[PDB]
Design a protein around this ligand. Sequence first.
Ligand code: ADP
Ligand code: ADP
Ligand code: ADP
Ligand code: ADP
Ligand code: MG
Ligand code: MG
Lengths: 48, 445, 251, 86, 438, 418, 126, 124
Amino acid sequence: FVMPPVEAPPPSLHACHPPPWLAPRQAAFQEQLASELWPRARPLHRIV
Amino acid sequence: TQRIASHSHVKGLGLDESGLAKQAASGLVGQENAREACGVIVELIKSKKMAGRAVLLAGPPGTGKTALALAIAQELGSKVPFCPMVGSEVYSTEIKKTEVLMENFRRAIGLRIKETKEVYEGEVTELTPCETENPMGGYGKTISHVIIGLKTAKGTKQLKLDPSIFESLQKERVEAGDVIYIEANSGAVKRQGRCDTYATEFDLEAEEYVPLPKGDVHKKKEIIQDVTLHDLDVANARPQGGQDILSMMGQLMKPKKTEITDKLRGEINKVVNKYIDQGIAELVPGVLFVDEVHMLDIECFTYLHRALESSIAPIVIFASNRGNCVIRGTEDITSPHGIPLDLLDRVMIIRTMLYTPQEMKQIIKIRAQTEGINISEEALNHLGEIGTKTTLRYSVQLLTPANLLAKINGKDSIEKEHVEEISELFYDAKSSAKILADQQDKYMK
Amino acid sequence: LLAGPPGTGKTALALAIAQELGSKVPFCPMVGSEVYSTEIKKTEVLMENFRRAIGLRIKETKEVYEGEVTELTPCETTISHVIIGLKTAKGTKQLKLDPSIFESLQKERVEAGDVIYIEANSGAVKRQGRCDTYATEFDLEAEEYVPLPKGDVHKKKEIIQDVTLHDLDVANARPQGGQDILSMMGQLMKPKKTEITDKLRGEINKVVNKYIDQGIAELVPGVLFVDEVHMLDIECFTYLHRALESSIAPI
Amino acid sequence: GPIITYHSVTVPLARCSRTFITFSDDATFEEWFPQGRPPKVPVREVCPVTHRPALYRDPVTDIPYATARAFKIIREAYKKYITAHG
Amino acid sequence: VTRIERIGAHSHIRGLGLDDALEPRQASQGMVGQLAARRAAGVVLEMIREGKIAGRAVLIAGQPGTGKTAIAMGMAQALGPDTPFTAIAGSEIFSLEMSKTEALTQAFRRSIGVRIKEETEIIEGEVVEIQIDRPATGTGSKVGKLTLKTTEMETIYDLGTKMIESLTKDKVQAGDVITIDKATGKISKLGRSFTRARDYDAMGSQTKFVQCPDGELQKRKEVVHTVSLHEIDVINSRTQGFLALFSGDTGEIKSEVREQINAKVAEWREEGKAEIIPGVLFIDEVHMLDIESFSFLNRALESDMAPVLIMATNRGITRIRGTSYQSPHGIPIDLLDRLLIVSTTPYSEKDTKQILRIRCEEEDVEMSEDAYTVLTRIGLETSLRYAIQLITAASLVCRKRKGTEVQVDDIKRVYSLFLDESRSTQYMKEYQDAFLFN
Amino acid sequence: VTRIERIGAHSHIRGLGLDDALEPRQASQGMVGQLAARRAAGVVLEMIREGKIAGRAVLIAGQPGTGKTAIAMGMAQALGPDTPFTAIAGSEIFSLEMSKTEALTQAFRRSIGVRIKEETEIIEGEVVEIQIDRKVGKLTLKTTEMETIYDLGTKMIESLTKDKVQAGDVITIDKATGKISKLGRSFFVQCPDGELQKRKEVVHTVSLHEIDVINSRTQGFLALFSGDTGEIKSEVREQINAKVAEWREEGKAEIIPGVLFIDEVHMLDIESFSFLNRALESDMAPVLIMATNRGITRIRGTSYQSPHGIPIDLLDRLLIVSTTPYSEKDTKQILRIRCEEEDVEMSEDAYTVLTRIGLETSLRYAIQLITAASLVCRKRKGTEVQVDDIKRVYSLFLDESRSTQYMKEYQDAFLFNE
Amino acid sequence: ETEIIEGEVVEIQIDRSKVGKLTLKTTEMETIYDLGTKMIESLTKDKVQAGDVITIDKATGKISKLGRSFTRARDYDAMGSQTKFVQCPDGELQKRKEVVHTVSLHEIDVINSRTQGFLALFSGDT
Amino acid sequence: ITPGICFSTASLVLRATDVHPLQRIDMGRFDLIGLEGRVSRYEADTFLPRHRLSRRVLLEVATAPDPPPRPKPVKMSPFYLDSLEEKRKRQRSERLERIFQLSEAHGALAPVYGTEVLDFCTLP
Ligand SMILES: Nc1ncnc2c1ncn2[C@@H]1O[C@H](COP(=O)(O)OP(=O)(O)O)[C@@H](O)[C@H]1O
Ligand SMILES: Nc1ncnc2c1ncn2[C@@H]1O[C@H](COP(=O)(O)OP(=O)(O)O)[C@@H](O)[C@H]1O
Ligand SMILES: Nc1ncnc2c1ncn2[C@@H]1O[C@H](COP(=O)(O)OP(=O)(O)O)[C@@H](O)[C@H]1O
Ligand SMILES: Nc1ncnc2c1ncn2[C@@H]1O[C@H](COP(=O)(O)OP(=O)(O)O)[C@@H](O)[C@H]1O
Ligand SMILES: [Mg+2]
Ligand SMILES: [Mg+2]
């Protein structure tokens, strides 16, 4: 039953003119990791 | 196994059927009283009705303490677990000292599991449903069995199985000419490939084609598996084989020993008791041998009181060559074997004495026999005289250099001259200490 | 050893030695109290600095195809090759790419009008924005618009880069890339210094010797300066006894 | 609709459990139980040149062979056949 | 066959051996003598059973071999499995994974049990006939029917898709005695009322049958769930905490998590959902704790979630670990003020003989009266533990010579074979130079 | 309303109180007396602001309660937020996450900043209509002076879809990144007035530590908030130093040297001091300011005695500023300043009594009694603190001397007396 | 000692991916192979195509790509980091591979310590 | 629920570690750990020493005409410019030299252990 008092998304790094390849690379990495690992995290659904 | 170690000649305790110790038997010479006491301890271990009993082997260095413990292990056999351990091993960078000690305690308690695995092997020749002349419900076809024909090298048998296996057969994609095995204890069909007789030299599959099974279609055997309580504890604390994210994390992350909880150990104990009551398993309480116990600190010694008082603990054998030394972890507290007096009250002390020159000569001869070395009588007497001074370990360590020197000289036996030359080439502790004292200015620190 | 009272110029003398050698010779300055790391043992720190002091000079010609993409056509037999069209201020060039670069081009999301560069030796693709000639194709897009490259599409440069043995050691301590799940999850793990094995050190030494014999590498032994060496403890000094006796160590 | 009925009953031999599977239509029964005949053992082909057991199969001529010399002879024969028949 | 639990040091202790008035019998339930200490332990046990006062500390102090651990084990056996009893050594709190205060907090919270009692509807019966109709191909709605039977009932149930899936996964057949929980749909097979058809092959050897359940089909049964505060803390600390219940590896649990759990458990207690079952933490050899641990103990006993703390020490005026201060029992005076001390006096000759008799009875060893006299003399001269060890040593020596009763000769033989601390120290003094460091 | 920043110990310090010639005033900007220390601190401030000399180290040494930390706080206030001022205690460098040398390296690099100016296009307005069709889209934005319709690209459409934007919302868009932040709704924030699309000059001052951490690994900037930096490799730091030198030479960036303040530096050990001896010799080293009240004392980690608990080799690199005890006039002026800070009214007799109490016992004890006496006065419905309130709080709260006397009276009842 | 198949890939035909054929050649030989499900999956995973010089282990079926043959149409201007051109192997398509190497006990321990334990032989994080 | 922290930094900071390809050497010539699980002892020791390409073979294949089409299975100059062509043949020579140099570079390293050794030593 224990819930954290506060819940926040991770801090985000913002630059006016970032390298245009960093964000797509991170997005692709996250997409692949989620597609490979989210099905494996389903048993922990009730705890979360 | 082929290499000769320091205790390669110890094949057990040379005890008569009445427990009296023979002067020289099973590779052991002398130490008759200690050997008799160790035989009594062996009977205690075999009785399997005592827990947490501790024995301390006390005596000067090179008096057979480790040799006696290894003789006990030889007497027990490979069936009985024997977990050797030095006191320095409790100092780990991953787990606490008490956890190391508890894990070593659980390693000594063994469990022997006996089960019968009954399987049906064969190449599927026939796959025929057994329809019923009166279909239930009036329409369609109803089946009451599925006949599976299994063919092996020396037979062929037909099995009238439950209709429910039709789903397993389809899931495994079992067809005629495939090699499958069915387990009686589970009622499941497993397809172990296709028969190799239907494979051509132009095929490229690797794990698809399997040889036709030899032997009978119905194979049953008794499986004896030996496990320890620590094996079950570790396999349950960091499980391997799951497909969830936690198992993936375990595979990814570096393995690390963890502090296994009393909850998991109690669950393992309950499962072990259930297996014992069912007749599946037989408990095999063994021995934990802790050499150089004096290297344990005061925390380890204190924990050993509770560890030994337990009803699940094995029989622990300690060994210490220290005198009135200072207990580690304490400031200027001296105890007779480096062991606090509280733990000495919980142990039975076996005393090992020094060796007479005759016993030293016998041990040297035995070691020469073990190392495949022929030594003359005069060389043996000179080496025994060398062993009267210096030590016994020094004399037994001159055998292989002297044998090599003889072989270089072109002789098949060690003569006295070879031992003299080796004694000149290599120094013992006392001679080196004399040199160091005579030249203490030229040495460092 | 530079021994003398404080303020007498030992550090200045070491820095003067470094100035006399020049920036081409590896001068690794370390303080004796820097060996007390919380990630690796002290001897590992000492050996890492020892390898830092030894330098390797590598002469290599690099080739990069750079320009705005005017055409991106994979040629089917699977894909036999990729024909790309790159534009610069000095003209247009048509290139035949190894089919393995198509995966990199698709990952980088390379379309016509994007300014990219392709490494000839590795097939690496970096999409460094859209061409500014297309900046007016929409009134509001979240795009980085980049000028058209000025020189030729094909750029050749002969370079001399200095690396140290520690750089080659740390490059082979952990794998890079990898599309497997274990490899991807390893990118999330916190980077920790590790006690690099002597097997890896020797293998890297063999590779370095191979390239020296080939003639594309040059060795610069270099200097490691340890200041406040009295902050080393007895274990560090004992390890230095062995390390200085190596045939691979620096001054 | 087309269904598969799984049925478990208690019937006297004092009682025993039996299971039955009922297929609504013969198509499902044929699909789950094709009653396939046992497969046939392939003929162990032999190289026409060296008479050793065949290990390879030239794709152009479909002639099995077991030696590089046999392959060269087979390809020479095929070239001669092309020259003659055209 | 030998179970995992064998004859240990305190296997003969089945309880404190007190009457209704907490008056110790001379010899009952394994305990012999220690009348005052056993009476005090009984009063403390009554205090534990009442479970109203939090953070009470008792110190069992005495000379080695005076029965401190025997009294603690008797208290544990008299409490019973319903009340938690966490027995640890003082050395166990020194851990590389967590702080000493965290280890002590976890030990404290392992000694308090939270019990949830709720009533659920339960169907228990013998499966007569199960029928499941499923589409031949493609996704569809499975339809089924189940018949359940008791000695006095038989009902036919129309089954839903999820109950159909549960029955299919459990592979429920006719004659299986199954239990169904209506809410969660969990199905537990507990036996077979009769055998399967004989004509089938690859079925295995049929086990014994189970009698069909009687009474009504859908009963109402009381379900009790009991966990400790530590288990709640661990499963609430992180998503992977439930695995930490077995692997340890809990790290340091946040104080926020523990405060939230204390609040939720108090709310449950007020609302009648859960009852708190306070237990005991027994720290053997508490003198291994340092000053920081003792300082934590001082204030951790002031919580209403604290259990009864029982310590054992055989130290006199000794240096406190981590300091240079001499204190009674190796314990700071601030902690000694928060606890009642139970002293154990040494045993007499008759108490020693009775303890030896109880040990022989526990070990199934038969001994003569002369052997008992000699063994009691040896125990008075050397120690009680040495004589206890000689009991089974002499049993083995007697069994070797094909005997039935342990005689004085066997005791003398084991006395010669196995040495005590005194004779070993004498022989080591005789060869002091041969031993390494003095 | 009560904000996070309440009245602290140095809340009244607003600067060093110096004129253009660095001549201290008797009472200015919350500072009283200590003319020599304040003048030396002003000279050090001029050195910091000049930014030419690297690795200069200054020690502020003096008895407890002599304005050492006050001098440091005034130095921090006189510098603006532009110049980095890293303030740590000596105990903070002892970590389980990294070594002491790594902790001091991070402390040094946190004190040097890199100021980078860049231009961005910012679109701020009120959303009128948003249309997206299966991709193409239109967006209509308005200010109080102009209205416009935009033809959207795929990436901006995705950005506007991810962050739910509907008509009436007041949003700002960074054109190059699609960074949309909703700052309210209008029909609550007033709609922007001027031009919809503005070219803005954004200036960031980034510390060397921030550059190293951001470039240490992918998503490495997260370690700037959760520790977890580990021990950053020296290769990354050398590469960053080289790139920062390249930027400075090319005009892309300016270096802003700052100040690292280590209060209670006597907590550092010999290893940390040996590291500081050579870390100050780099061209990227900031100005180091330390404070200690130790006399000739054992250096931590050794058995050697040194004048400040600091080894003599490091002391040879320091300029020492000595703080002198306060007089009756300075003590009374400090008490007046603290009373003004806490909004407490005292009588002149109360000021005299409190000054005598502070001189006899301690300035911090007297400052503490100000709030207690004010509370006692407010309890009895009074408005101005009297001598009776001061005597009441004097009796209620003891100082170190009277507490030690009472403890010595019953020393047997206390625990572990030497 | 291990039996391998070694040749240059000429054609890969897969019908529909249940069954297909693979043609391999040497400078002195050429043959066609019938593929199964796992062989087809392994070939598709490694993206084996024409002109690739590969070896296949007969016992385990694992496929490692040695290189690709050079033709007039493979005159690439940019090459990937792993592509390299090799000559077509000579001799017979079926070959025996003998590998002799010396490893220590510690290396075998590290390899079997974890799933990818051989990585610890470089990092030292054993 | 709180909004995340938006940490803003200079765009130049994100390019601090970036080095242009024309300014850095190829580190794949020292990549030993990348060969593990991909490169075998056979390739490094037996195959490549025998079947490495040579410049002569590469030039012969490039200059030679296209091979004849594989047989089907049987069941049994006014606008000519000299400068442009000279440029084109120089480009072809450079391309062939690059192919050769890259093929030699990409198979120069031998694994420390190799797939066979790891497979042999890897127990179930
Ligand atoms: N009674 C004995 N009979 C035969 N070999 C012995 C005997 N005592 C010692 N040894 C041998 O002499 C060597 C000395 O080791 P050991 O006696 O075990 O030293 P310690 O008792 O100090 O551990 C070993 O090789 C041991 O096997
Ligand atoms: N001989 C010298 N000539 C010029 N400058 C010197 C000389 N010796 C020392 N210095 C300067 O004086 C300071 C102290 O010298 P340093 O090398 O730090 O002494 P240490 O031997 O203690 O390291 C430095 O700023 C250094 O540049
Ligand atoms: N009063 C008693 N009744 C029964 N057994 C006892 C008694 N006192 C001690 N024992 C037994 O003698 C041994 C020593 O007592 P123990 O409680 O371990 O001493 P300690 O006070 O040092 O813990 C144990 O085996 C214990 O079971
Ligand atoms: N010259 C001064 N001007 C104003 N306030 C001062 C002065 N000196 C000390 N204080 C104040 O007295 C208190 C004591 O702190 P401080 O004297 O800085 O301690 P220390 O110098 O021992 O670190 C603080 O509230 C501080 O602001
Ligand atoms: Mg006890
Ligand atoms: Mg201060």
